[PDB]
């Protein structure tokens, strides 16, 4: 770590509020609650460090959670939430938030 002092894993600002073997429900209620006038979220997810397909969908800016389904049980996925406060063509936000997790 260094230099006599501590090292931590980076924490996630996402919460997993529901889990079954093939699905996870994530909440960003405690983060994009502060960053505001969100129009929609784009959620992406794929097997962590996999060759696997990265799937995506969008939900309205007033949602606080989304379900990710069709997962492999017990396999680690990386889930990333992008908040969009504008529809301006070609805009991408500065700081998406993510989590690594398995059912």
């Amino acid at each position: 770590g260094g230099s006599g002092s501590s090292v931590s894993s980076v924490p996630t600002k996402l919460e997993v509020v529901d889990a079954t073997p093939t699905s996870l429900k994530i909440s960003w209620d405690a983060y994009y609650s502060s960053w505001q006038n969100v129009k929609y979220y784009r959620i992406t997810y794929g097997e962590t460090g996999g060759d696997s397909p990265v799937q995506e969908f969008t939900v309205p800016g007033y949602y606080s959670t989304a379900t990710i389904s069709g997962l492999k049980p017990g396999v680690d996925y990386t889930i990333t939430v992008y908040a969009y406060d504008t529809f301006f063509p070609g805009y991408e936000p500065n700081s998406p938030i993510s989590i690594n997790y398995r059912t």
Partner: protein, 98 residues
């Protein structure tokens, strides 16, 4: 393309109304007409009603819902009417889920 969060492809008026059924003020989608292929419409929720607007194409190929405000692309039109209602019942705020 249907890459955009607000674009839902061919959806009838009636199906559009049910899609907005659980939305709030400013919920909307852009769809293709089932009865007039090639034509596009905006469906927008406001105060317990759904407002349907035909998107027009002028002869220079620009798109508009209000004559004063014409754009090169659907994305520019949506961005514009998300900023200012400009003839719509309200601003485009939340795209119906996708």
């Amino acid at each position: 393309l249907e890459k955009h969060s607000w674009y839902h492809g061919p959806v009838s008026r009636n199906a559009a109304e049910y899609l907005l059924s659980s939305g709030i003020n400013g919920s909307f989608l852009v769809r293709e007409s089932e009865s007039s292929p090639g034509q596009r419409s905006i469906s927008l929720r406001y105060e317990g009603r759904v407002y349907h607007y035909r998107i027009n194409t002028a002869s220079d190929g620009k798109l508009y819902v209000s004559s004063e405000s014409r754009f090169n692309t659907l994305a520019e039109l949506v961005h514009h009417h998300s900023t200012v209602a400009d003839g719509l019942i309200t601003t485009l705020h939340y795209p119906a889920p996708k």
